[PDB]
Amino acid sequence: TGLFVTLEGPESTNRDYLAERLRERGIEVQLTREPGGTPLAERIRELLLAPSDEPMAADTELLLMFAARAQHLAGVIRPALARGAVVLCDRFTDATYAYQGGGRGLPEARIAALESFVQGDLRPDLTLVFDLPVEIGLARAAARRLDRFEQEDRRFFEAVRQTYLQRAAQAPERYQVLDAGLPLAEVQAGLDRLLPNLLERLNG
Amino acid sequence: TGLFVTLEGPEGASTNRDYLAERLRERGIEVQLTREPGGTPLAERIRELLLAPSDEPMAADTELLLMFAARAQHLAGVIRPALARGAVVLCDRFTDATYAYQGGGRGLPEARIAALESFVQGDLRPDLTLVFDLPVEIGLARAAARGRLDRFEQEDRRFFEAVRQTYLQRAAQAPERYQVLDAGLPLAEVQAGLDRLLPNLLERLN
Numbered sequence: 001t002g003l004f005v006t007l008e009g010p011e012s013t014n015r016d017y018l019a020e021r022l023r024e025r026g027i028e029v030q031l032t033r034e035p036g037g038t039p040l041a042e043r044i045r046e047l048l049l050a051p052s053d054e055p056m057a058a059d060t061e062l063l064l065m066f067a068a069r070a071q072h073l074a075g076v077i078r079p080a081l082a083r084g085a086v087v088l089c090d091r092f093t094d095a096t097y098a099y100q101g102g103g104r105g106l107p108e109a110r111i112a113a114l115e116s117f118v119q120g121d122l123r124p125d126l127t128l129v130f131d132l133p134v135e136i137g138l139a140r141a142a143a144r145r146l147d148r149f150e151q152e153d154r155r156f157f158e159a160v161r162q163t164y165l166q167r168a169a170q171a172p173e174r175y176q177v178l179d180a181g182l183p184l185a186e187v188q189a190g191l192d193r194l195l196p197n198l199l200e201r202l203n204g
Numbered sequence: 205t206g207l208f209v210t211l212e213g214p215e216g217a218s219t220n221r222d223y224l225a226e227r228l229r230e231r232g233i234e235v236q237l238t239r240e241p242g243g244t245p246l247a248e249r250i251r252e253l254l255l256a257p258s259d260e261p262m263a264a265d266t267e268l269l270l271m272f273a274a275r276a277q278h279l280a281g282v283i284r285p286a287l288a289r290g291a292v293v294l295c296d297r298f299t300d301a302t303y304a305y306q307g308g309g310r311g312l313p314e315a316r317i318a319a320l321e322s323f324v325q326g327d328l329r330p331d332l333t334l335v336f337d338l339p340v341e342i343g344l345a346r347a348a349a350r351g352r353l354d355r356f357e358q359e360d361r362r363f364f365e366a367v368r369q370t371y372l373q374r375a376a377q378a379p380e381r382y383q384v385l386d387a388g389l390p391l392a393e394v395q396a397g398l399d400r401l402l403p404n405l406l407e408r409l410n
């Protein structure tokens with residue numbers, strides 16, 4: 001039956017730390033990320049992130065995101081959950097609501113229609129939102145060539161951050177919001193702290 | 205304004221699209237020629253993913269969504285703008301092929317294809333769809349004559365028979381927007397079958 005956990009936030013050792021703590025307990029952990037997660041899904045990821053002179057329609061972006069999600073769900077996520085694993089997935093449909101919804105301005109109802117179409121009843125059991133002011137995360141990206149999303153403006157990323165926060169506030173039972181700026185030791189302490197509940201979810 | 209015409213049929217083999225175009229151009233009509241999946245740089249990249257054989261099985265939902273992603277890009281970038289300027293769009297393959305290949309061939313429910321059709325296209329449908337019907341064997345041989353078989357061309361005989369039957373069923377349910385042409389006739393009988401077709405086209409335009 002497993003547990004489907006997703007990790008979200010604006011633009012790594014967090015997931016690894018959580019994975020190590022779970023494995024120590026004999027729990028199988030499947031690490032993955034979106035868009036991507038399978039060879040085909042990664043090829044779709046490439047098209048989505050590559051800058052181009054041709055404008056990508058909002059609907060195209062949304063449909064490609066969901067095409068990669070369908071492949072990833074079928075190939076990686078569902079099988080893992082069927083083995084009883086905890087899936088730790090970097091980004092999922094919350095990112096679609098934030099980026100394609102908040103950022104692009106596509107209506108929530110249309111994103112929800114595809115969510116249902118692609119996922120059926122399946123939703124993450126828990127979503128960890130690593131929150132951070134937009135400028136700091138874009139500077140982090142700027143510090144390492146920016147892809148199609150990374151090169152968007154302030155309005156865009158502010159919509160992204162606030163969409164994440166609003167969805168978490170609306171269904172607090174499904175989310176935990178963390179401050180992604182804390183000292184490493186203090187981040188890990190927060191990860192330790194959320195672990196008992198994660199295990200209660202799995203064993204529930 | 206404008207007119208949206210799609211050209212469909214069983215797998216196999218461009219010539220007719222380019223021909224009808226000539227009859228229309230000589231009348232002073234603007235014609236925009238195109239094809240799916242593809243039609244734009246990104247849509248062509250999506251075509252390449254869809255056609256490339258792989259040892260990873262592509263989920264049916266993935267195939268359907270990539271097909272409609274390319275369609276969405278193509279509609280926004282090519283089709284709607286052309287119709288807006290009053291051009292005739294002549295498009296090799298469109299959503300009928302989704303019903304035939306993803307529905308008939310893959311076995312995806314018609315309802316799910318229709319859901320995405322409405323999602324992507326809203327109310328928009330082709331004004332006229334020409335189905336170039338032909339025994340499956342002939343078309344497959346044309347497609348196989350040269351080059352490597354792509355993801356679809358690698359399929360089995362039953363898959364392509366299902367494709368053909370779906371096209372015929374759909375056309376028979378809406379005779380007003382479909383014309384079925386025998387692609388297994390002498391070029392003269394089919395070029396002239398296309399000739400006998402122009403007056404209807406031109407009228408649909410005006």
Ligand SMILES: Cc1cn([C@H]2C[C@H](O)[C@@H](COP(=O)(O)O)O2)c(=O)[nH]c1=O
Pocket residue numbers: 011034035065090091092093094095096097099100149150
């Ligand atoms: C999963 C997902 C990611 N994205 C974006 C966020 C990132 O800018 C980009 C690549 O993700 P990444 O930053 O974690 O590597 O994909 C969406 O726009 N919608 C989605 O549904």
Ligand SMILES: Cc1cn([C@H]2C[C@H](O)[C@@H](COP(=O)(O)O)O2)c(=O)[nH]c1=O
Pocket residue numbers: 215216217240241271296297298299300301302303305306356357
């Ligand atoms: C437009 C479209 C094409 N196809 C397939 C049929 C062909 O095998 C393939 C390439 O088209 P083509 O043979 O005309 O070059 O695309 C679908 O499966 N669904 C669709 O919606």
Ligand SMILES: [Ca+2]
Pocket residue numbers: 011141150
């Ligand atoms: Ca990024």
Ligand SMILES: [Ca+2]
Pocket residue numbers: 346347348349350351352
């Ligand atoms: Ca060939």
Ligand SMILES: [Ca+2]
Pocket residue numbers: 215216217347357
């Ligand atoms: Ca072919």
